[PDB]
Swiss-Prot record:
GO terms for molecular function: aspartic-type endopeptidase activity. Coiled coil: none annotated. Belongs to the peptidase A1 family. This is Endothiapepsin. The gene is EAPA. It comes from Cryphonectria parasitica.
Length: 330
């Protein structure tokens, strides 16, 4: 089997991407944030505290003929941005882009933090990291990908995120029309439960490539590119007037600037992030200070190749017995 679904930016900045997901019988379509940095499929639901729902579409298990309470199971998750959610669990039929999994754990939110309530465009998350990170207790559950894997034509999914445009998540096949050149594969460590890999270095604009090992995670659920302070300082030093603002919470730059590109290494291959991808616009409405898309990972404890980096590539998440990542230009 295979699946193929379009993923759409939630706003003009590409702050996140939503993908329609069918849950239950008859289908209830929710728009979920596919997150390769976590391993829970959780939704706004009929059980979510009413004051914490503001425009999201909800899953109502009582209206699904295939829903079953997973008796005694609970979940509770905290993300890198300080957001959180928790609740109980149903199993139900879940389809993505024509690929169906029966008996998928659908984590029904009873509580969500303010950042989730305030984002009306995101109806929940679909985690695509390793199932070792799934928070369901006392019986840990499998991700949609892990449950689909055995049925897929190839044990892979691919992320093809757009810049200010829709893109695609495919399951079970590699669309050879969706990228240019060849795919470079690189090793993955699953020790922390992430798609963790080591970049071979970086360049700023037209500058020379610096060969240096940068361990980090491929995380579709993180907007920005978070790298070591040395790397980030070297980037922003090439932008007149850029500075790190403790008041704003990262590097800002004059909105009048033209940003340089950023290159990262994948083995001997190179992925170029155009400068425009690094512009996250005014810090507040009407400001002439703009927020940067490359930020320091200092204090986060991991480097994160978020959407800013991933959207510059066609990315293969190879879930074979020995997992690997692949990157291609596009």
């Amino acid at each position: 089997s295979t699946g193929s679904a379009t993923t759409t930016p939630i706003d003009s900045l590409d702050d996140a991407y939503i993908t329609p997901v069918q849950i239950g019988t008859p289908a209830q379509t929710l728009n979920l944030d596919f997150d390769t940095g976590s391993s829970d499929l959780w939704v706004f639901s009929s059980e979510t505290t009413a004051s914490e729902v503001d425009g999201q579409t909800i899953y109502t298990p009582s209206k699904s003929t295939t829903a079953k309470l997973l008796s005694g199971a609970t979940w509770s998750i905290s993300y890198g941005d300080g957001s959180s959610s928790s609740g109980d669990v149903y199993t139900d039929t879940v389809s993505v882009g024509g690929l169906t999994v029966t008996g998928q754990a659908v984590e029904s939110a009873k509580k969500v933090s303010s950042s989730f309530t305030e984002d009306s465009t995101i109806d929940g998350l679909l985690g695509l990291a390793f199932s070792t990170l799934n928070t369901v207790s006392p019986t840990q559950q499998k991700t949609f990908f892990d449950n689909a894997k055995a049925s897929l034509d190839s044990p892979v999914f691919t992320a093809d995120l757009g810049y200010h445009a829709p893109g695609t998540y495919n399951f079970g096949f590699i669309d050879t029309t969706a990228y240019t050149g060849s795919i470079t594969y690189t090793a993955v460590s699953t020790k922390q439960g992430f798609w963790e890999w080591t970049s071979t270095g970086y360049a700023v604009g037209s500058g020379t490539f610096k060969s240096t090992s940068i361990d980090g995670i491929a995380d579709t659920g993180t907007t920005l590119l978070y790298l070591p302070a040395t790397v980030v300082s070297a980037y922003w030093a090439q932008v007149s007037g850029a500075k790190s603002s403790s008041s704003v919470g990262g590097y800002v730059f004059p909105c009048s600037a033209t940003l340089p590109s950023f290159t990262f290494g994948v083995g001997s291959a190179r992925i170029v992030i155009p400068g425009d991808y690094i512009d996250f616009g005014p810090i507040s409405t009407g400001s002439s200070s703009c927020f940067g898309g490359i930020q320091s990972s200092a204090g986060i404890g991991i480097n994160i190749f978020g959407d800013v980096a991933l959207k510059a590539a066609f990315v293969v998440f190879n879930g074979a017995t020995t997992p690997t990542l692949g990157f291609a230009s596009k």
